Design an enzyme around this catalytic site. Structure first.
Site, short mmCIF file in Angstrom:
data_model
loop_
_atom_site.label_atom_id
_atom_site.label_comp_id
_atom_site.label_asym_id
_atom_site.label_seq_id
_atom_site.Cartn_x
_atom_site.Cartn_y
_atom_site.Cartn_z
N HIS A 215 -0.05 3.25 -35.79
CA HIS A 215 -1.43 3.59 -36.21
C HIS A 215 -2.38 3.52 -35.02
O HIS A 215 -3.50 4.04 -35.14
CB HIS A 215 -1.90 2.69 -37.34
N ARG A 216 -1.96 2.93 -33.91
CA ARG A 216 -2.77 2.86 -32.67
C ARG A 216 -2.87 4.24 -32.01
O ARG A 216 -3.81 4.42 -31.23
CB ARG A 216 -2.14 1.87 -31.69
#
EC number: 1.2.4.2
Lengths: 305, 305
Positions: A215-216
């Site tokens: 998700h980064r």
């Protein structure tokens, strides 16, 4: 019973799963119609038994669709690293697809390891099928090298083999996404119904596909768009035209459509008109030319009938 | 409104969920037919109301199937620990099954705690049912000891009670897997249909079961094989024979089969032939002997009719 130290390949698996705890992940789930896969796969395997070739599998077709989807949405091939103490986005040169190959050890205990099909963005379906079967062949006779296990960008797993409906798997450090393929059965609410009653209604089989991402670097909207493209491809005319062309199948592929009602001209009348068409005009699509040649000057007759 | 320190049993729950962050987990999901459970459970509860016994629940049956599955796949009962600074695999002596029992406190606030049915690998269904109802009884009259809360190897939770379809639960330190049981309703797409139309088609109810496991010691292929064995057992002839034998049910269990079409001899004719069979030959299976005795010398008549 008791306590035993972990040693060997099993110790390596344990250490990598501890490192995986430093990746923040999210998963998306989507269910897709499967009928047209079953039909068009049967047509390719019919052509191959005429030419004493092999078979193709469902994992071959879904694998190739996955490569086409990553080319349409290239963010899915990126990863994260901390380099000289700063956050960094890593954009690779190639799409290198990792397969989950399970090889038994000398003792007897099973141990999964991931091998890579390299430079997949430069391949057609025929080239892709050859590359795949190379890795599977060499694994079964113990001739994989160190280079075969290095450089994976994206991965594919198949829990559906045993009959699992879907999974939420873990993501190993170095990659951005892992794709999972579930079971191709009827739902459990239809597993005791008659073949006659299911045929009347028009109930098909489905496959469930998952996406687990970092998700980064990958956002949720991108992951959803990726799964929508895979759904479209497995029902698309152009996709199945490209596969048939590569494998040298002389017929037109079966197309996707909704079931029509038995109104107006009865369906029995329609089946009798199809028998007349083949008896009259079927010579126009017959395997009569020993060359793959069409004279460009001459006009091509209509054979939609 | 405002801020309040966490105290008591609620502080203990909070600390254990912080420790759980150091376990890397993955989950598998599978949906299973439920019709034969509904039918065969009704036959056991009919026998018990004749003998002024109690009822059995769906949690009793699924719980017993879970024990049989762990015996077929013993890797599911193992755990991980770091002992003298080295990684270690822990293989217990017994299968100790933890139940999620919710007991209200003196204040009023609900607080879940897990009690254990111990040495479950040495029990038949009758013994298992007794052990289960002991823990539930003592909990309701506040007579559980410290030893009842220690030594759990594997756990069972039931979100389906309220009507949840499935969950992805957390795994507490010390164990290797947790199993979750979801709702036994029709799917949401059938919840407004007629009983007549559903009966015509042959639509059954389903149950969804999940497995959440520690990936350092249990691999995905083992978790899938475990859920496949549970599916087979709940539809298997030998499984339901063993339960009926223990509870002293005189009839043969209902068997699993596909719905057949109403062709050839009409189904009304078949129901009239069943009425004649019972009126002629039904005395061959009647509760006439006050001993559980069959003379071994004499030949047994056929009663398949």
């Amino acid at each position: 019973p008791g306590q035993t130290p972990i040693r060997g390949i099993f110790k390596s698996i344990a250490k990598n799963m501890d490192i995986s705890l430093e990746i923040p992940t999210a998963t998306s789930v989507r269910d897709m119609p499967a009928r047209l896969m079953f039909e068009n796969r049967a047509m390719v395997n019919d052509q191959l038994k005429r030419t004493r070739g092999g078979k193709i599998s469902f994992t071959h077709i879904i694998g190739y669709a996955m490569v086409k989807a990553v080319m349409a949405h290239p963010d899915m091939n990126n990863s994260y690293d901390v380099i000289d103490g700063k956050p960094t986005l890593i954009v690779p040169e190639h799409i290198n697809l990792g397969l989950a190959i399970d090889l038994p050890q000398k003792d007897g205990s099973r141990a999964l390891v991931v091998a890579a099909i390299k430079e997949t963005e430069k391949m057609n379906f025929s080239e892709f099928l050859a590359a795949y079967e190379d890795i599977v062949a060499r694994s079964r006779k113990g001739k994989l090298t160190m280079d075969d296990y290095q450089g994976v960008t994206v991965s594919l797993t198949n829990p559906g083999g045993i009959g699992t409906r879907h999974s939420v798997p873990r993501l190993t450090k170095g990659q951005g996404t892992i794709i999972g393929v579930g079971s191709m059965d009827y739902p459990a609410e239809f597993q005791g119904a008659s073949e006659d009653r299911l045929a009347e209604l028009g109930v098909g089989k489905l496959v469930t596909i998952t996406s687990t991402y970092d998700h980064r670097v990958i956002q949720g909207a991108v992951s959803g768009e990726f799964l929508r493209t895979m759904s479209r491809l497995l029902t698309d005319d152009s996709f199945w035209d490209e596969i048939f062309d590569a494998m040298n199948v002389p017929y037109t592929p079966m197309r996707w459509a909704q079931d029509v009602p038995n109104t107006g001209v009865d369906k029995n009348t329609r089946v009798m008109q199809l028998i007349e068409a083949y008896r009259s005009r079927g010579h126009l699509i017959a395997d009569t030319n020993p060359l793959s040649w069409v004279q460009p000057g001459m006009p091509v007759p209509d054979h939609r009938d």
